[PDB]
């Protein structure tokens, strides 16, 4: 949707590949991409590098009274789309160990 044309979105790639993409870009703190979840069809994964380890955060869709939102914490922090989610965590950590600092591009 609003995320197809974003440099940090990589669609359907695997966990092993998102790691290899971030690795081939230096394992810098703050490197990230968002991908379609492999296990979960309607879900997404935020893959992020911190302290030279790649971490993976499940993004799940839900509904409040007919309105779709996404969340990484069981609805405790809700976002209308992935861009809102990504933009927020460029400024605020929330449940993440560090900010989304450098977009891992493709």
């Amino acid at each position: 949707a609003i995320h197809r044309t974003q440099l940090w979105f990589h669609g359907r790639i695997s966990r092993e590949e998102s790691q290899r993409l971030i690795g081939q870009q230096g394992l810098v703190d703050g490197l990230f991409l968002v991908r379609e979840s492999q296990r979960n069809p309607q879900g997404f994964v935020l893959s992020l590098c911190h302290l030279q380890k790649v971490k993976h955060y499940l993004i799940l869709p839900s509904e409040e009274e007919g309105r779709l939102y996404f969340s990484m914490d069981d609805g405790q922090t809700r976002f209308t789309d992935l861009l809102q989610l990504v933009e927020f965590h460029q400024l605020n950590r929330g449940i993440l160990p560090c900010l989304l600092r450098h977009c891992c591009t493709r």
Partner: peptide, 10 residues
């Protein structure tokens, strides 16, 4: 949490 995943929250 989500098994398989790093989400850490109350």
């Amino acid at each position: 949490w989500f098994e398989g995943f790093d989400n850490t929250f109350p």
